[PDB]
Structure formats: structure tokens, C-alpha cells
Design a protein around this nucleic acid. Structure first.
Length: 164
DNA sequence: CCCCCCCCTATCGAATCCGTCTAAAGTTA
């Protein structure tokens, strides 16, 4: 039974997200209802309040959120997946690339495995189909590599024989 | 009253025309 075992929550502020991850996710994880956490965007709440002159409170909030998420994941042996946005690059491993992860080094220090789903739309689009590539940025045990995939009516499928 | 520290962000904005070639078919005392 698929739909009956997926839980949906909605938040609209950084404080709301902090309170939710503090006092709702542990209740769900304690009873064994779920063993997986997905955040559809972490950059969306943060890119609205804190400007370029308020980096200290932003870093404090990011550190607190990362610590809480890592503690929960370690305690309940449940994966945590975070979806992130990108910014424009106008020293951190990004030289021949026009986009970088949004939050910065403070949030990048809290992570374990970093992927980068990319679509090359400006070029090789006249061939008739989109070109989608999933790349491994960093991992303690995974070499940097990439593969190709497509999105169809049934889900995401990886193209065989295309690993870098 | 005493002695030492913190942190990145975010795309924009179109211009500029050139250079000619190849001739064919007689008619009516």
C-alpha cells in the first residue's frame, strides 16, 4: 500500500522549519512509521530573510539544522536527503562550471555525499531530446563520475552503458 | 573584580551586408 505510508508536511518559514525538524520528525521516527526524510528545498526559506550582511545568524541556523539532522539520522539509522538550489559563479573546486550550490561552505561542511543533477539545455537541444546528467561531486568512498538518465511517464530511468 | 571570539551574495546584455554573367539565327526571282 503505497500512498497510505507517505507523510506530507508543509512549512513556510525558517523558524517553522526548525520547530518542525525539532519536535515532529523524532515523533514519526520513534514509532517506526517512517525511516526516510526528504526536504524538498533547504535554500528556499533561507534565501528570503538573511541578506549579504547577516551571515552570522544564517550560519548559526545552518549549523543547528545540520547537527539536529545528523543526530536524528545516526540515532534512527534513517537516510536524510536534501534538495538544494544553485547560484551563479561570478577555490572550492568549481572552476569550469557556471553554477554552484547555494548555501555555501558552512552548509557544505555538514554533508556526506554530494550529487549534482544537471540538464544541458543551451546546447545539444536541437537533437530533439533533453540531455540530463547526474554527477557525483564528493563522497568518502565514491570516485567522481557521472551518468545519463531520462524522465518518462513511469519514472526516472538511467541509460545503460554511459558511466564516466 | 579577573580573561578571550563570527561571517557570503547575486546575472547582464545584440551587432553587421556583399558581389555580375552569358550570343543566336537566312530569306525570297
Amino acid at each position: 500500500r503505497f500512498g497510505s505510508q507517505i507523510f506530507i508536511e508543509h512549512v513556510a518559514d525558517v523558524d517553522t522549519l526548525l520547530e518542525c525538524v525539532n519536535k515532529k520528525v523524532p515523533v514519526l521516527l520513534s514509532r517506526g512509521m517512517a525511516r526516510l526524510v526528504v526536504i524538498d528545498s533547504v535554500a528556499a526559506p533561507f534565501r528570503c530573510e538573511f541578506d549579504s550582511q547577516a551571515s552570522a545568524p544564517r550560519a548559526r541556523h545552518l549549523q543547528s539544522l545540520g547537527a539536529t539532522l545528523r543526530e536524528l539520522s545516526s540515532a534512527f539509522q534513517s537516510p536524510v536527503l536534501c534538495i538544494n538550489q544553485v547560484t551563479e559563479a561570478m577555490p572550492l573546486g568549481f572552476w569550469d562550471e557556471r553554477v554552484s550550490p547555494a548555501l555555501g561552505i558552512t552548509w557544505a561542511n555538514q554533508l556526506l555525499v554530494r550529487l549534482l543533477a544537471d540538464r544541458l539545455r543551451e546546447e545539444e537541444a536541437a537533437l530533439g531530446c533533453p540531455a540530463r546528467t547526474l554527477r557525483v561531486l564528493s563522497a568518502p568512498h565514491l570516485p567522481p563520475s557521472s551518468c545519463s538518465y531520462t524522465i518518462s511517464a513511469e519514472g526516472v530511468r538511467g541509460t545503460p552503458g554511459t558511466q564516466s
